[PDB]
Structure 1
């Protein structure tokens, strides 16, 4: 997990508020209006990608340990910083029938980011 506060420069999760207006689901979403979905961003370097704490850690480690010695289709696929935990969000909309439905969309937002 993380908190993208301060001059942090790693896979931290930067808070981010998305407006359904700004994307145009304005109309088919009832509320809630907008909301924070944030995301993952930061350099995914060395002695730190397996230290992430994230799910994707150990594996990521057992991977780099390859491109470290530029091996197979690997030396040229960079560990990019992604999401590794997302809780769902309950909202309100018109199903395909135009009725009014409250459901909780899964992994609609990001709890933790990780290196990969």
Structure 2
């Protein structure tokens, strides 16, 4: 899979999972989230050559088209595949609010 095991601690140009830890206050200026203070959002980035983790038939065809005609700028894109949720705690005055946000953390990537 295009996951941490394959992707982290390898520097490759093709589509792969890239690590990214976001500190809510420091990076986004969100001072209102109480816990957690940050999380491993991660992201997907890299080239999508022919048949490299192709999502659909369209990704397969476009990955071949883009190899032949790169000027078209029609390459498939390296995007999230598997994601995980994140539970946050924030206050609303003194009313503690707990919310489970789905699809917050990316665990694997694909060429779509």
TM-score interval for Structure 1 and Structure 2 normalised by the shorter chain:
0.7 to 0.9
**8 Å Cα contact 2:85-2:102 kept in structure 1:** yes
Does residue 88 of the first structure (1) align with residue 85 of the second (2)?
yes
Does residue 24 of the first structure (1) align with residue 24 of the second (2)?
no
What's the Cα RMSD here?
2.5
The residue aligned with 2:106 is 110
- Measure the CA separation in 2 of the matches of 1:57 and 1:94: 42
**8 Å Cα contact 1:57-1:114 kept in structure 2:** no
- Name stretches of at least 5 consecutive residues in structure 2 with no aligned partner: none
- Name stretches of at least 5 consecutive residues in structure 1 with no aligned partner: none
Question: What's the offset of the Cα at 1:94?
Answer: 2.9
User: What is the CA deviation profile of residues 54-96 of structure 1, one whole-angstrom value per residue up to 9, with x for unaligned ones?
Assistant: 6x244411444556676xxxx432222111221111111135x
- Measure the CA separation in 2 of the matches of 1:42 and 1:66: 17
- How has the CA–CA distance of structure 1 residues 11 and 69 changed in structure 2, closer, same or farther, with 3 Å as cutoff? closer
The residue aligned with 2:59 is 60
**TM-score, with normalisation over the residues of structure 1?**
0.74
**TM-score, with normalisation over the residues of structure 2?**
0.76
- Measure the CA separation in 1 of the matches of 2:48 and 2:97: 40
- Measure the CA separation in 2 of the matches of 1:57 and 1:9: 21
Runs of 4+ in 1 over 3 A off after TM superposition: 62-70
User: What is the CA deviation profile of residues 95-116 of structure 1, one whole-angstrom value per residue up to 9, with x for unaligned ones?
Assistant: 5x76211121000110211112
1:36-75 to 2 correspondence within 5 Å? Answer: 36-48=40-52, 52=53, 56-64=55-63, 75=72
Between structures 1 and 2, the one with greater helix share: 2
